[PDB]
Design a protein around this nucleic acid. Structure first.
Ligand SMILES: [K+]
Ligand SMILES: [Mg+2]
Ligand SMILES: [Mg+2]
Ligand SMILES: [Mg+2]
Ligand SMILES: [Mg+2]
Ligand SMILES: [Mg+2]
Ligand SMILES: [Mg+2]
Ligand SMILES: [Mg+2]
Ligand SMILES: [Mg+2]
Ligand SMILES: [Mg+2]
Ligand SMILES: [Mg+2]
Ligand SMILES: [Mg+2]
Ligand SMILES: [Mg+2]
Ligand SMILES: [Mg+2]
Ligand SMILES: [Mg+2]
Ligand SMILES: [Mg+2]
Ligand SMILES: [Mg+2]
Ligand SMILES: [Mg+2]
Ligand SMILES: [Mg+2]
Ligand SMILES: [Mg+2]
Ligand SMILES: [Mg+2]
Ligand SMILES: [Mg+2]
Ligand SMILES: [Mg+2]
Ligand SMILES: [Mg+2]
Ligand SMILES: [Mg+2]
Ligand SMILES: [Mg+2]
Ligand SMILES: [Mg+2]
Ligand SMILES: [Mg+2]
Ligand SMILES: [Mg+2]
Ligand SMILES: [Mg+2]
Ligand SMILES: [Mg+2]
Ligand SMILES: [Mg+2]
Ligand SMILES: [Mg+2]
Ligand SMILES: [Mg+2]
Ligand SMILES: [Mg+2]
Ligand SMILES: [Mg+2]
Ligand SMILES: [Mg+2]
Ligand SMILES: [Mg+2]
Ligand SMILES: [Mg+2]
Ligand SMILES: [Mg+2]
Ligand SMILES: [Mg+2]
Ligand SMILES: [Mg+2]
Ligand SMILES: [Mg+2]
Ligand SMILES: [Mg+2]
Ligand SMILES: [Mg+2]
Ligand SMILES: [Mg+2]
Ligand SMILES: [Mg+2]
Ligand SMILES: [Mg+2]
Ligand SMILES: [Mg+2]
Ligand SMILES: [Mg+2]
Ligand SMILES: [Mg+2]
Ligand SMILES: [Mg+2]
Ligand SMILES: [Mg+2]
Ligand SMILES: [Mg+2]
Ligand SMILES: [Mg+2]
Ligand SMILES: [Mg+2]
Ligand SMILES: [Mg+2]
Ligand SMILES: [Mg+2]
Ligand SMILES: [Mg+2]
Ligand SMILES: [Mg+2]
Ligand SMILES: [Mg+2]
Ligand SMILES: [Mg+2]
Ligand SMILES: [Mg+2]
Ligand SMILES: [Mg+2]
Ligand SMILES: [Mg+2]
Ligand SMILES: [Mg+2]
Ligand SMILES: [Mg+2]
Ligand SMILES: [Mg+2]
Ligand SMILES: [Mg+2]
Ligand SMILES: [Mg+2]
Ligand SMILES: [Mg+2]
Ligand SMILES: [Mg+2]
Ligand SMILES: [Mg+2]
Ligand SMILES: [Mg+2]
Ligand SMILES: [Mg+2]
Ligand SMILES: [Mg+2]
Ligand SMILES: [Mg+2]
Ligand SMILES: [Mg+2]
Ligand SMILES: [Mg+2]
Ligand SMILES: [Mg+2]
Ligand SMILES: [Mg+2]
Ligand SMILES: [Mg+2]
Ligand SMILES: [Mg+2]
Ligand SMILES: [Mg+2]
Ligand SMILES: [Mg+2]
Ligand SMILES: [Mg+2]
Ligand SMILES: [Mg+2]
Ligand SMILES: [Mg+2]
Ligand SMILES: [Mg+2]
Ligand SMILES: [Mg+2]
Ligand SMILES: [Mg+2]
Ligand SMILES: [Mg+2]
Ligand SMILES: [Mg+2]
Ligand SMILES: [Mg+2]
Ligand SMILES: [Mg+2]
Ligand SMILES: [Mg+2]
Ligand SMILES: [Mg+2]
Ligand SMILES: [Mg+2]
Ligand SMILES: [Mg+2]
Ligand SMILES: [Mg+2]
Ligand SMILES: [Mg+2]
Ligand SMILES: [Mg+2]
Ligand SMILES: [Mg+2]
Ligand SMILES: [Mg+2]
Ligand SMILES: [Mg+2]
Ligand SMILES: [Mg+2]
Ligand SMILES: [Mg+2]
Ligand SMILES: [Mg+2]
Ligand SMILES: [Mg+2]
Ligand SMILES: [Mg+2]
Ligand SMILES: [Mg+2]
Length: 88
RNA sequence: CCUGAGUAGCUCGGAAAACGUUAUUUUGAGUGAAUCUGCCCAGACCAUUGGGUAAGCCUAAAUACUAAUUAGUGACCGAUAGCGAAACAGUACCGUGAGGGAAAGGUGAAAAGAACCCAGAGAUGGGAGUGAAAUAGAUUCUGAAACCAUAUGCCUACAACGUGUCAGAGCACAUUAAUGUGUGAUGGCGUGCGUUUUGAAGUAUGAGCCGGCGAGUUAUGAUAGCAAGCGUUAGUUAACCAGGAGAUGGGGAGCUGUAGCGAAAGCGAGUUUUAAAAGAGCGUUUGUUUGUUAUUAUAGACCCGAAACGGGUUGAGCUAGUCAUGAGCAGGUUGAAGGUUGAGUAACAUCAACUGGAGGACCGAACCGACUCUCGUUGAAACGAUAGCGGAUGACUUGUGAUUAGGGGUGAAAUUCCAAUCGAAAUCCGUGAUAGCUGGUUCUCGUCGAAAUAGCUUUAAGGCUAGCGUGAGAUCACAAAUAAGUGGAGGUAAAGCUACUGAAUGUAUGAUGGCGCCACCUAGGCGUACUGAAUACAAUUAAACUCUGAAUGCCAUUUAUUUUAUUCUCGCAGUCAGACAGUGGGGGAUAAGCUUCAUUGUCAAGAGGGGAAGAGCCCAGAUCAUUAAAUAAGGUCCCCAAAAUA
RNA sequence: CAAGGAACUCUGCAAAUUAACCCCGUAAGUUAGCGAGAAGGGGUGCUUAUGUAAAAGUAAGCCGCAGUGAAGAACGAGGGGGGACUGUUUAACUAAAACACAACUCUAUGCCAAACCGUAAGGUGAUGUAUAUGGGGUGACACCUGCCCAGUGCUGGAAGGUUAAAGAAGGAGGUUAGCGCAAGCGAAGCUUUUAACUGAAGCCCCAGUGAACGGCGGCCGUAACUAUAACGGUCCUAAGGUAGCGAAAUUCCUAGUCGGGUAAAUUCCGUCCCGCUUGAAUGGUGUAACCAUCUCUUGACUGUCUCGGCUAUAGACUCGGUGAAAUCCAGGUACGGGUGAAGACACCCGUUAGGCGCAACGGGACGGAAAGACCCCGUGAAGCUUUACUGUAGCUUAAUAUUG
RNA sequence: CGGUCGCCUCCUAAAAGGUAACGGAGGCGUACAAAGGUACCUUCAGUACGGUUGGAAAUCGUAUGUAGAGUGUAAUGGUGUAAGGGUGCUUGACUGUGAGACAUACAGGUCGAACAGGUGAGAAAUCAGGUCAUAGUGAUCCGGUGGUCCAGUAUGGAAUGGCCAUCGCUCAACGGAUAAAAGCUACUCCGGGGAUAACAGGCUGAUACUGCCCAAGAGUUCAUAUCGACGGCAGUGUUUGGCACCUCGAUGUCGACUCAUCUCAUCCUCGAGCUGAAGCAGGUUCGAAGGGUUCGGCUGUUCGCCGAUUAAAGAGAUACGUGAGUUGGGUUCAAACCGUCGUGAGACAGGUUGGUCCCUAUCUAUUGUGCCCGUAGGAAGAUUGAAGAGUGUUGCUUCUAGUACGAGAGGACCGAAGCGAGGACACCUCUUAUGCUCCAGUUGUAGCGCCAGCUGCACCGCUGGGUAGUAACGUGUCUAUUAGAUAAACGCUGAAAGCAUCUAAGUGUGAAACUAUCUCAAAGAUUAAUCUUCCCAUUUCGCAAGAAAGUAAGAGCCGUCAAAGACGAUGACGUUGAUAGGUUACAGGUGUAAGCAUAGUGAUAUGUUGAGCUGAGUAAUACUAAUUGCUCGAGGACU
RNA sequence: CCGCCCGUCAAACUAGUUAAGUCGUAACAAGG
RNA sequence: GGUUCCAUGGUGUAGUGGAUAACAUAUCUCCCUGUCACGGAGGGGUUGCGGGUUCGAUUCCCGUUGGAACCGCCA
RNA sequence: CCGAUAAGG
């Protein structure tokens, strides 16, 4: 005897968006490359770093990326692109 | 003046052409013109221009094929091959019929085919004789293996056996002279071969043995590798003609490359987009014809296998129905209707006797049928035997002849019967139907060597792309690996709940209600067996709680070392059923040798040693030989190699 | 086969009793025909005499345990289910409750009839004529067959709305003779397309039709012991199951309650009725006779059984002759525990066992025969069904030609 | 069958990203001309106090409060001078593009610096290519619409296309087979699968069953005589279950019959402790598997209820044992009907009637019986017994004794005797069954030419008896007893632990269980045993567990047989013999034979006549058959 | 006539019988 | 075991696409009659429980009770 | 249209 079985009601899931950090600290970067994909600003933008229509951080100039912790109780993260600054 | 009338057109349904109906061609129904200043055509249609003369007929050559006659050829076959048929083969044989359809060759140069003798009844055998050969003898070229017997030598009747292998006495011989050969008392080790599977000694599968046959081809094209010829206004011919069924010569028709871009007109080392010249896309160069190999497309395309479908023929001699003409039912009972007579009736009705011999009547043989037991189930028999059983003058049984034929016939109807076959006969043809499904696929060695994953799929036993393999080439460092150091992202383990959201324990102060007792009909008051907001103290819980919070892992960079590849391009794949062990979890019940994930390993595709025996556990990675040495996991009383002290 | 006699078994399957002739006797029920060979009993030999054409019979006597001395001859009673009956059926597993049958009813058909075979000719119906033919349903005989025409089917219907082909008043473009400085306009001719309007059947709509496809309910309260509800209220439908029968070939609960049959009764008989889901021509309820039908009780009877035993043949077994079969990887083929692809002749650890036959019986060799019929899979096959899709034979309506 | 099929958010997801399940929770197929863009200004919800309507909570003022407010939405993340609120002006909710990246099999998706044109806000810097961010979406084909610097099949147009923009799909099975599509098959078929179910096995033990731990309580009072809650821990595989590892080139599945075997968690019998055990009869626990554990009614039944007995009518396992052992009642083929479902073909773990069960045994296992060889000289006898097999049940009556006990009622332990049921072994004196070359009676027919008398056939024709043999339904026996070592239990003497204490030393008692006693077989017991008796003990040559001949006990072949027996074998005999047949005599069985005589008319009766006949039985008798025959067979190595 | 009275249903005892049960109002007047 | 429907006054049933709840019987008061039934007038009485969304739930959503209607098969 | 009227006195 099988006795019959009930039915499940929740078996739905969405595609996983590949968010997170893309360029790590110290890595050289050119303008227009993505540094951080997020839903809502988890990492604030600094100098030479822009914002998009999806809160995506992209570079604005050549240089080395660099994360600096700031904000109350050092709970806010900020990214920047320190220009090559070779300066001979 | 004549030049082809139910004609060309047009409408409604079809078709032919590459066209799935449409300018052109044709027609089943209807309608219906004009007459060289005419009619038709040049992809709807009109005008200009141009081309051609429908509604009449005949027409050689080049073209298609070979049953047959003559000559000849073959990198075609040589009795399981070649036509099914080398012989008297469409024969023997099978079937009612259409139809299906075999096997089988060889004496010797010459029959000189064995006179004669012996045994025997004879065939025949042993001699003789012929012959080069008779172990060439009609059983007739050679004569393989499986299979059956005889014998020299060795072993075997206390012995647990995938039948072998490594050692090993004794016994008996002497060779492709080789640390020789035949047997093997005894000791150690030892669960076949292919297939398909995560995994087969397999209580999964296929083969009784031997021998023969039996499965990647051909034609036409495309791409790629290798090689040759010719080359920078290159390269190369197709058909056809001549030549031996030739190499080849003629034949430049054409095909590829030479300039690209754009949908296209078009422009041109530029072009498309755009107002743009800016920007961006594509270009601003490396050829062709063959030979060989690999893959692929169309053909049956590696081989074998369906249930089927469509078209044609042959079957009612069995059986089912109908029709024509015949025959059969031993024997014995019951005694209807009707009629006659008599009584009776006013006359009927009714009753009694006699006659009469009807019944899908009764009993029971031949005959027909098949309800039961037993036997038989490779039978006596592809449906019967013995013993019983039902009908047996009728819707009966039976002989002969005719007739109804297959998306049809017949059917007192069960999917019955239609030649031992019927959810729709038998046979031949399309046909070598198709099969993402089983099974099989044939010589060797060397190098390398996977996957059982993701997405899509009328997809889940299949397919495509990506991932992993292999071959060739490029990239030398800036690429990729192994270690050390540094920087960064994160919110897990843990911990905490005065840092939130829920859950939640006790103590103290206590909103609140329940509960009372009063007064007051409405504003309320004093205690509450008790409920419990909020606050303070002390203690708790959480995948979807976080004021916090690692390690590992990940990304990048620095230094040292290593490899030309884990990176890029091209050719060819296989893989899409996984299994177990440790670790972190989900589902289950902190069950499963369960199921689904992440990660480290093994097996798959991997032997050896330990675990007594074990695919996945531990130690490790088998090129071959050695009766050499040191070790890993594991172990040292005996089986079974190795120990002792305290 | 002694004693018992169904205790056997799913079931008296099988086996057993009776059996021919003659003489007595024969019930309930009934369609008055039957039941019926009912049930139950008796006699059978030989001789003499009497009887007859022959008998049969009659009287006396004799023998045996037994006299149709052997062979061939019906076992019976009672209740129930179904089919009225005789019959027919699945050649080769189902003979029956299935089919058929006489009978009832509905429907179509006026004759070149309806229906049917073919494509048509032709033919069956039928050399028949509504007292005839074809089809659907029910199935003697007796009594009955209730309500619903909402949906579907069939028949008929005035007008009205919608609708194809076809015909057709016109409309819109293409082209250019021509008019115009251009622009643009623009005759006829042809040509592309649209079209008012006319246009049958059918459908929408209106009535009838059930022995046409079919259908034919709930809730609440209520009587002077309790119990129940004659009765009242209300919702919906086209109408809410009438008579009859009812634990049924139908009843799930259920081995329903009670009575009978038995020492004891899931079966049987009668009755009760919340009949989940009975029921009136897919008919309802009874019914004499009949059944190789199903089911239950019973007398006789017996080896079915308590319970097994004996005898005779043919096998089997031995000798002489002829001489197969399926199966088969090679075998020299033990047992216990464990292991293993999870149930071992072969693996590990132990135990036992001289070599080889013959007669037996079947434990195993997941024994042999049949590429599992059950289950699943395949973008498999075939048969059948329908308001699945797309078509089509046939039938019917209109336009057009033959056609005045 | 139910549920789901595309996209988005969180957790599982193990602090990069990614990661599945018919895992746990939710949403979406949009909304906004402002909720967009810009410039400027501005900042919670709640709570406390104070105040008409006005109330717990509308609005006002002040203060407090660090987000519990808002951010259109399902969640997540973000954001309190923000991305939240208000106002003014506007439409960048632009055109042509686009270096570089994220993520990806592809197709698609996401972010974007910067350039040219022309705008909006703003003094300007600057910002604006839709919104705080992530869901709000559908390829290709086909056709339609607008624009157009392209084509226009001889030419000019037109028709028809081309390019750009745009429209029509809950193509939601959402990478979409076609513009268009539902069911039954028990009348079925084909290719495959243990990739996947039904039977059995395997793993698990949720559930089931058995047991234990704590003690609340019940129990004249008293947890623990007997029960045992609320809770917890195990054992078995033993019900219902879970997984899908073996098997779909076949593992026959319920019940019944036959044969049984094993386990103990013991129903009876046997022993003991406690008792709320006076006696009898009980309750519970411990030890114990040797034997036994009935017949019937209904049902296919297992199960179950009922009837009558018994000492008892045990629980399970063995492919829910057993179809190459039987049956086929049930399930489950084709046929038919009822109820119900479906419009239908058909369907129902709903009901009913009927319906094919094959195989000659090769290996191994087992029951019996043989040949060969070994046991070291051969043969004939008699033994011991290592290792084994078989049986083991129990009731009633009398006595003890109406004694023990008990007001009474009732009623023993221990022991003895008699009679039985079941099971087993053997036998045929008795009773029965059978008794196919026996006796008698008797029917029909055909024969012996006829009567009489016999023979063949009719189930051995039928019927009544019946020798030997074979058997039970029959009668004899067994189903005892004893010893040893013990289980549970009880001990005596005794310390560790001056007491106590069955134990540690020592010494006992103790069950149908165990080892023997009882019956059978047994030296292939290769570990091959022991004893007794008998027969071998040559001549030569050379080579000795050597030869040529040459030496006996015994055995076999063959024949007659049955105390035996499928065939072998076993046993008796083979002329010096009673082995078989025949003959003779007798037993037992049958029942007065044929013929004759008498009587009767005849069937028939009487006397001769307890007569005749007789398969196997008992014993004598060589009359016949077992012939006057052939073969095998011995010197025991050495230590 | 605010008289009389019938027939179902319900209860008990043996169709009848029953002091005060329920639904109607059929008959006695022209019983409507 | 699974799936669909329902829960409204004292009893039988409608509505509400969120802002609102009626019908009949029954009940009460008063005419009515000798009285009562019937009749006439007037009066009165409502979303199963929970928990979310909304400013607002009988209505919308998810759970929990009670009553029904369907299914639970192939071996 | 128009129905009813508890028992013994
Ligand atoms: K199987
Ligand atoms: Mg996500
Ligand atoms: Mg064509
Ligand atoms: Mg001309
Ligand atoms: Mg043209
Ligand atoms: Mg002309
Ligand atoms: Mg040939
Ligand atoms: Mg040959
Ligand atoms: Mg012939
Ligand atoms: Mg010769
Ligand atoms: Mg030969
Ligand atoms: Mg030869
Ligand atoms: Mg030996
Ligand atoms: Mg030994
Ligand atoms: Mg061994
Ligand atoms: Mg081995
Ligand atoms: Mg091979
Ligand atoms: Mg397999
Ligand atoms: Mg497998
Ligand atoms: Mg094997
Ligand atoms: Mg198999
Ligand atoms: Mg296979
Ligand atoms: Mg085989
Ligand atoms: Mg040439
Ligand atoms: Mg007759
Ligand atoms: Mg067809
Ligand atoms: Mg059928
Ligand atoms: Mg046939
Ligand atoms: Mg083929
Ligand atoms: Mg196919
Ligand atoms: Mg390698
Ligand atoms: Mg792998
Ligand atoms: Mg993986
Ligand atoms: Mg597939
Ligand atoms: Mg934690
Ligand atoms: Mg907390
Ligand atoms: Mg887990
Ligand atoms: Mg797990
Ligand atoms: Mg697994
Ligand atoms: Mg593999
Ligand atoms: Mg290994
Ligand atoms: Mg090992
Ligand atoms: Mg190596
Ligand atoms: Mg060493
Ligand atoms: Mg050693
Ligand atoms: Mg008897
Ligand atoms: Mg008797
Ligand atoms: Mg019986
Ligand atoms: Mg019985
Ligand atoms: Mg019979
Ligand atoms: Mg009778
Ligand atoms: Mg009846
Ligand atoms: Mg009949
Ligand atoms: Mg009949
Ligand atoms: Mg048949
Ligand atoms: Mg039959
Ligand atoms: Mg005619
Ligand atoms: Mg009928
Ligand atoms: Mg009938
Ligand atoms: Mg009717
Ligand atoms: Mg009508
Ligand atoms: Mg009745
Ligand atoms: Mg029955
Ligand atoms: Mg009855
Ligand atoms: Mg009817
Ligand atoms: Mg009836
Ligand atoms: Mg019959
Ligand atoms: Mg014979
Ligand atoms: Mg195991
Ligand atoms: Mg198969
Ligand atoms: Mg298909
Ligand atoms: Mg992560
Ligand atoms: Mg991680
Ligand atoms: Mg939100
Ligand atoms: Mg905004
Ligand atoms: Mg299309
Ligand atoms: Mg043109
Ligand atoms: Mg899809
Ligand atoms: Mg098959
Ligand atoms: Mg499996
Ligand atoms: Mg357990
Ligand atoms: Mg006590
Ligand atoms: Mg266990
Ligand atoms: Mg059990
Ligand atoms: Mg699995
Ligand atoms: Mg198995
Ligand atoms: Mg097999
Ligand atoms: Mg088999
Ligand atoms: Mg079998
Ligand atoms: Mg015990
Ligand atoms: Mg004993
Ligand atoms: Mg079991
Ligand atoms: Mg069984
Ligand atoms: Mg059993
Ligand atoms: Mg089971
Ligand atoms: Mg068996
Ligand atoms: Mg069986
Ligand atoms: Mg059999
Ligand atoms: Mg078997
Ligand atoms: Mg049966
Ligand atoms: Mg049968
Ligand atoms: Mg059927
Ligand atoms: Mg119906
Ligand atoms: Mg032994
Ligand atoms: Mg005697
Ligand atoms: Mg005579
Ligand atoms: Mg003491
Ligand atoms: Mg003792
Ligand atoms: Mg030896
Ligand atoms: Mg004698
Ligand atoms: Mg005499």
């Amino acid at each position: 005897s099988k006795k019959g079985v009930g039915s499940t009601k929740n078996g739905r899931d969405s595609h996983a968006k590949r968010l997170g950090a893309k360029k790590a600290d110290g890595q050289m970067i050119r303008t227009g490359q993505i540094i951080y994909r997020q839903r809502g600003t988890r990492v604030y933008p600094g100098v030479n770093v822009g914002l998009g229509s999806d809160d995506t951080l992209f570079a604005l100039s050549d240089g080395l990326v660099k994360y600096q912790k700031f904000g109350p109780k050092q709970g806010k993260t900020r990214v920047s692109v320190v220009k090559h600054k070779l300066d001979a």
